Amino acid sequence: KMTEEECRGYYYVYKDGDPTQMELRPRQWIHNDFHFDNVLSAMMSLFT
Amino acid sequence: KPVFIDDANFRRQVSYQHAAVHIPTDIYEGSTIVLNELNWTSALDDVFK
Amino acid sequence: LPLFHIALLVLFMVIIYAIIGLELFKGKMHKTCYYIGTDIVATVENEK
Amino acid sequence: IPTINLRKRRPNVQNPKSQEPVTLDFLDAELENDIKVEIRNKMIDGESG
Numbered sequence: 542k543m544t545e546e547e548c549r550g551y552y553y554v555y556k557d558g559d560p561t562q563m564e565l566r567p568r569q570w571i572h573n574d575f576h577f578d579n580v581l582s583a584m585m586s587l588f589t
Numbered sequence: 590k591p592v593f594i595d596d597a598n599f600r601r602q603v604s605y606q607h608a609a610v611h612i613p614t615d616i617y618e619g620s621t622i623v624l625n626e627l628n629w630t631s632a633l634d635d636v637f638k
Numbered sequence: 639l640p641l642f643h644i645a646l647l648v649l650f651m652v653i654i655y656a657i658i659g660l661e662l663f664k665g666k667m668h669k670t671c672y673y674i675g676t677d678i679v680a681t682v683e684n685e686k
Numbered sequence: 687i688p689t690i691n692l693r694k695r696r697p698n699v700q701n702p703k704s705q706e707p708v709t710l711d712f713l714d715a716e717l718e719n720d721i722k723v724e725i726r727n728k729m730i731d732g733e734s735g
């Protein structure tokens with residue numbers, strides 16, 4: 542789901558790559574913990 | 590919230606006032622593509638009846 | 639050439655702790671959590 | 687012959703159950719003859735008798 546308007550709902554995860562064994566998980570538009578989104582933010586990433 | 594009489598010829602509780610809707614699970618409902626079916630398809634409940 | 643006395647000291651320091659470590663922890667790490675009556679290893683979501 | 691491996695079913699994931707149609711054949715619902723494969727073919731091609 543390539544954007545935020547799509548990434549709503551539930552999706553199935555699959556455990557150890559086995560297609561017969563699945564669990565529903567809600568899907569959310571996650572944002573990275575280190576990002577380049579304002580300059581202060583960019584600097585923290587560079588420091589890491 | 591429908592009222593669900595119990596029935597024979599269906600061995601389950603059922604409502605004769607409207608039609609249910611099944612959305613599959615990985616499909617989100619509320620998507621414009623899905624929201625627009627539940628709009629136009631809502632005229633079937635009169636022909637169903 | 640100057641570094642030779644160091645690299646001979648690093649080798650005799652790995653050989654002590656390879657021997658000591660072996661004696662202390664040999665054969666210990668062969669009992670992971672498993673689901674009852676199954677061969678699936680039971681871990682939490684981001685745990686190895 | 688059904689073979690399921692108990693050593694590889696983790697207990698709480700719920701695999702698919704079934705979707706196949708129940709296609710039993712006339713020569714498998716009853717003991718087969720040669721004088722019934724004549725009857726069976728003769729009423730697949732829409733004849734009376």
Ligand SMILES: *[C@@H]1O[C@H](CO)[C@@H](O[C@@H]2O[C@H](CO)[C@@H](O[C@@H]3O[C@H](CO)[C@@H](O)[C@H](O)[C@@H]3O)[C@H](O)[C@H]2NC(C)=O)[C@H](O)[C@H]1NC(C)=O
Nearest residue numbers: 607621623624625626627628629630631632633634635636
């Ligand atoms: C799909 O959903 C739309 C939105 O609910 C439905 O359109 C609505 O249809 C009803 C009846 O056709 C409209 O009611 C009418 O309202 C006008 C005043 O706007 C009034 O003069 C009429 O006498 C009647 O009360 C309703 O307004 C209309 N909504 C909009 C925004 O136009 C549509 O019917 C649904 N489609 C199907 C197939 O059910």
